[PDB]
Amino acid sequence: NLTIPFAKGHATENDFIIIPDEDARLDLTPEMVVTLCDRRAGIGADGILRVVKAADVEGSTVDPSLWFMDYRNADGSLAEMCGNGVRLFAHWLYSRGLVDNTSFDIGTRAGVRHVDILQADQHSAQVRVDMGIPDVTGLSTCDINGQVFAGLGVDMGNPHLACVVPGLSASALADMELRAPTFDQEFFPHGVNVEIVTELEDDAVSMRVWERGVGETRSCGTGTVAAACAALADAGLGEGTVKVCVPGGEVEVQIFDDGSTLTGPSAIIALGEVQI
């Protein structure tokens, strides 16, 4: 029935359909989302980022003149957390001349985010995003596939449990076989994302992640910040700069005593039109 312009891109292989809607002319229903993000029947993504002014988003109470990351999960749901996504949305905004400043603010359902474009062209960027104060909630354990791991619990807006594993190489991490983890039920009352991480080594670590009711993913933004907190803690530091390697790429995490940042890439890989 309607043909609309779109783009496809990803931030460390967490991939999105960007749908411009400057004039908020699109009623994008949860069934339309689910269709569009169907990898075999549609275009295929982890979600849609619709480009709209905060003004026009039902329920945003942020400054109405911001651009708002109207972010939908692949199941249609209104995402309340955001991560890697922000890097892509920032990239689109800056490269299409929708903002004109390398440093600006983005309306999201989790509140305003602040970003800094560090490099940007039509296809690639590096973006620094302010991720909030990590809330460390303490030691916990989990079981994956008949093995206990010590982790550090971390709240970034959503819960994580980051298990830094002394001895474990990047290879051995690669070779482990993951399964839905079991963990402390009462410690995590809304479930938990679990990261397995190597130890700080040249200010870097490698991570794999099991997201909450999703399973293994290529990249989880909030998760890389969690892993960085843990890897620092596992070494006796509370502040620092860590390169985190996930299956989808590399980010850089900065842990301050009063905040955190995530720095990493974004890619706009295709442009076209799609039918409803």
Add this chain to the structure above:
Amino acid sequence: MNLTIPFAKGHATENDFIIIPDEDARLDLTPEMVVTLCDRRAGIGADGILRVVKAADVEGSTVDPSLWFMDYRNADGSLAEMCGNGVRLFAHWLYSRGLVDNTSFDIGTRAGVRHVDILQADQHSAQVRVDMGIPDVTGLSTCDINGQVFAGLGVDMGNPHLACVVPGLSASALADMELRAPTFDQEFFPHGVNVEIVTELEDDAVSMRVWERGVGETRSCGTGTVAAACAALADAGLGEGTVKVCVPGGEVEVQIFDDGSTLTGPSAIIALGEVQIH
């Protein structure tokens, strides 16, 4: 370098492809490019690439040079022959973009010429019939899926099949089975096999699920639907007929004769655009 390529994304009963128009045979499309494009998160994502090129510009093409050739690449980069589903989408592309003038026409493939008939088409949707050859029932064998033994029929459609029609299987209970990679007779199927689990012919229809060799479960297998319909007819004591086959990605209609078979089914063209390879 990077390279920007015009493309389309489509599917045939949710067996999905990237179509890449290359009428002047200018694009050198390598296996590593194919892999990158077909990557669902770093690329566009698909089961394969259909490059639209004249058979005159494919080396080793058996067919008439004036035909369009489906230069079909699998997602892993390897060259392929034919796809029951993908031919439907290719036919749809050629016809809806005016590259052929008739509703009935031939297409070149690496398995030889294929004859298609456009039943309905516009820019987004179509219904296409393809002639799929005489099935060759190679024998009776069995498999084991996740502990449970199924009896079936060897079918050679150009590639090996064990179509297992299961008396007393409802569609409900087919949808709830847990599929795992089957075990099979390695002597009967020395090159692997595609396994279809099928219900029994009822009101001229069956439902199927398929585990494709080296790929696991898919939403649709074109040659599988034809194997499935053979087995369904043979389990009903018939040698010929028309069967609607329901796969998780949609519905098709198989006609079996003594001297051949056809597969009719849908095609959709979902998007158009341009893509930059890394």
